[PDB]
Structure 1
Amino acid sequence: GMVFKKETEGDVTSVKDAKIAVYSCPFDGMITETKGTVLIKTAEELMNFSKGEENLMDAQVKAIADTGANVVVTGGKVADMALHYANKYNIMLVRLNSKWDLR
């Protein structure tokens, strides 16, 4: 059966009979640099964008848990805020995947 070299992140699937959700990039990771006017005027909207980002990936692992899939395949990188809700939801995660892994 299918052998994936990529390191298993989070706990194991809830069932071995799980529905396999294969996604190109559901989870992200944030870093930025100087803008059109360099280094934007506040850090409050940086905190305001960071709060909805966690509740976004909270609901992403939740809606996969609601729809029946107990494993998510991430061709993009793993978010930290996505990760600690995925452990409680008992859904297995792949940290990263290449072009051949998804196809």
Structure 2
Amino acid sequence: DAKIAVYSCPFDGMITETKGTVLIKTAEELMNFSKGEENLMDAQVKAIADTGANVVVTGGKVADMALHYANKYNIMLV
């Protein structure tokens, strides 16, 4: 009864800020991104009440962080 959460590309690829011409030198942009994805799928397992989505589809890459987030949330993402 997985009332699908329908999206085209709910996730994006790899990026990294440059402080100027040269690249940034901090990992906060990655830690905050990971925690944001975690809380987004926490809100997903909240919004299963009004959506009922055990599955979702994307055209954008996700990482193994999303893999174990899904495993603890019991969801699938193509």
Q: TM-score, normalised by structure 1?
A: 0.49
CA distance in 1, matches of 2:25, 2:37: 21
- Tell me which of 12, 18, 21 is aligned to 1:28: 12
Q: How far did residue 89 of structure 1 move? A: 1.9
Deviations 1:26-66 (A, max 9, x none): 12342337553312365555545554454345434653576
Give yes or no for contact 1:27–1:74 (8 Å, CA) kept in 2: yes
Higher strand content, 1 or 2: 1
Q: TM-score, normalised by structure 2?
A: 0.59
User: Gaps (5+ residues) in structure 2?
Assistant: none
CA distance in 2, matches of 1:45, 1:93: 23
CA distance in 1, matches of 2:29, 2:16: 14
User: Gaps (5+ residues) in structure 1?
Assistant: 1-16, 95-103
Question: May I ask how many residue pairs the two structures share in their alignment?
Answer: 78
SS in 1 for 2:48: helix
